[PDB]
């Protein structure tokens, strides 16, 4: 007549590492490291992303005509650029403080694209039809959808000065560009005054531009270039443009709303009808476990990224059958 | 282990015991059987659930132009340092927690054995492998008396004394 003490054993092959021992077979364990993704771009807390397709941020904002136009009002949970978006700054030049603008839009949840200066009533006695082959659409030479090339009309470039007052209750992002012809002769034939000047003012922004004429190596077969500038007109403030040449006037601007939890990712995954709390450039994640070795770039409530291949916590016993 | 029971003086586990982490095997006249110890198993499940829970809840994209290399490298240093710290912390925590959990199970089953032994006294002999051979007849009621912690030593004291001689 005997009685015995013992402990549970089963057929589990789960193994966990300890300090003193490595391949320890245990009766039960729980995994803490998520390593699986669905390979899809999915909605985030019920909101679809904003996909730019062939355009990057610069091409979309400036209005590169090669990119399928987006609806006038859009709202997203995160922005997706694709790795090699062919369309961007199509007429050569530098996008001044571009990275800061990317960072700004990293917290934007909304845009309304609205006409700020209509083509036919904002710049009288100037020609609004300038195009170029550097930004071609449908084979023929074109120009940005959100800007307007102001040229001389009938041999004269009168001094223009226009204004906008922000009555949208939100920040309005305004972009424009300044042209730099390669030779003086072009500046003459385009704006008629060699010493032209542009001035853009708000209550907290202030800049004055003067065309810098110099022969430059031709990029997209353009020896002259075109700088692009931007600003955030606060609610109630006024933006003032004054010029006598070289100004690439704004036509469409954006009324922005600010949100939480968004960002910009580069991904060549495709949008599916799905929903997650955690998006990575490779796919969605279940945000249930504390760690993930999928991608350091995450958007949403997401496990902490680590380099480990295995994080497994034993709950059962040492399996000795 | 650290407490000598699991993989120690109790060489292996019991796949026949499907009802608990720790427990008993008996063989008397009326037959044999396994029987989990539900209170110790439930307390261990409580503790380990708490451990898993607190580990689960202890844890709760920029660009740069050509002339901002220093800031790019500082951002990368920050990201890499945080990554190093968190990988280190996760792996360390898991290792130490696994060690402590295995030792917890070892301690629980050794405690079980000692409770039975100090209940039984010289009314039985330790025959190794975590088993006691009774010096008296112990029916299913006596086995449950050992399990529930209510073993009556003077009830069988004299009979076990006689057979122990």
């Amino acid at each position: 007549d005997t009685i015995c003490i013992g402990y549970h054993a089963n057929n589990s092959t789960d193994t966990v590492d300890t300090v003193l021992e490595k391949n320890v077979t245990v009766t039960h364990s729980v995994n803490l490291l998520e390593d699986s993704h669905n390979g899809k771009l999915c909605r985030l807390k019920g909101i679809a992303p904003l996909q730019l397709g062939k355009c990057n941020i610069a091409g979309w904002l400036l209005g590169n005509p090669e990119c399928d136009p987006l609806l006038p009002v859009r709202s997203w949970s995160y922005i997706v650029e694709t790795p090699n978006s062919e369309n961007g700054i199509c007429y050569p030049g530098d996008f001044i403080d571009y990275e800061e603008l990317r960072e700004q839009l990293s917290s934007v949840s909304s845009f309304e694209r609205f006409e700020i200066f209509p083509k036919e009533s904002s710049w009288p006695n100037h020609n609004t039809n300038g195009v170029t082959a550097a930004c071609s659409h449908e084979g023929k030479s074109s120009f940005y959808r959100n800007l307007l090339w102001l040229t001389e009309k009938e041999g004269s470039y009168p001094k223009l000065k226009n204004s906008y007052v922000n009555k949208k209750g939100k920040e309005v992002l305004v972009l424009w560009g300044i042209h730099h012809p390669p030779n003086s002769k072009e500046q003459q034939n385009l704006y008629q005054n060699e010493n032209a000047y542009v001035s853009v003012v708000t209550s907290n922004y202030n800049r004055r531009f003067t065309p810098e004429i110099a022969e430059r190596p031709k990029v997209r077969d353009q020896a002259g270039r075109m700088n692009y500038y931007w600003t955030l007109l606060k609610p109630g403030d006024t933006i003032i443009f004054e010029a006598n040449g070289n100004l690439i006037a704004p036509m469409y601007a954006f009324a922005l709303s600010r949100g939480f939890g968004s960002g910009i990712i580069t991904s060549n995954a495709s949008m599916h009808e799905c929903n997650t709390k955690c998006q990575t450039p490779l796919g969605a994640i279940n945000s249930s476990l504390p760690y993930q070795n999928i991608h350091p770039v995450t958007i949403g409530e997401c496990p902490k990224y680590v380099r480990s291949a295995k994080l497994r916590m034993v709950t059962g016993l040492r399996n000795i059958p | 282990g650290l407490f000598g029971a699991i993989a120690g003086f109790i060489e292996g586990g019991w796949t026949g015991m499907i009802d608990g982490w720790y427990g008993y095997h008996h063989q008397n006249e009326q037959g044999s059987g396994y029987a989990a110890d539900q209170k110790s198993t439930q307390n261990a499940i409580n503790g380990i659930t708490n451990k898993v829970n607190t580990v689960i809840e202890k844890m709760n994209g920029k660009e740069f132009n050509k002339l901002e290399k220093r800031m790019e490298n500082l951002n990368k240093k920050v990201d890499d340092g945080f990554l190093d710290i968190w990988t280190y912390n996760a792996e360390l925590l898991v290792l130490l927690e696994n060690e402590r959990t295995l030792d917890f199970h070892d301690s629980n089953v050794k405690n079980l054995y000692e409770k039975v032994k100090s209940q039984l006294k010289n009314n039985a002999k330790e025959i190794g492998n975590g088993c006691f051979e009774f010096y008296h007849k112990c029916d299913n009621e006596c086995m449950e008396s050992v399990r529930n912690g209510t073993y009556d030593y003077p009830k069988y004291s004299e009979e076990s004394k006689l057979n122990r001689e």
Binding site: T27, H28, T315 | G20, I45, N46, T49, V52
Partner: peptide, 13 residues
Amino acid sequence: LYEDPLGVAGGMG
């Protein structure tokens, strides 16, 4: 039959 919300003991009573 234990109160095991996380399945720590894999069912088991």
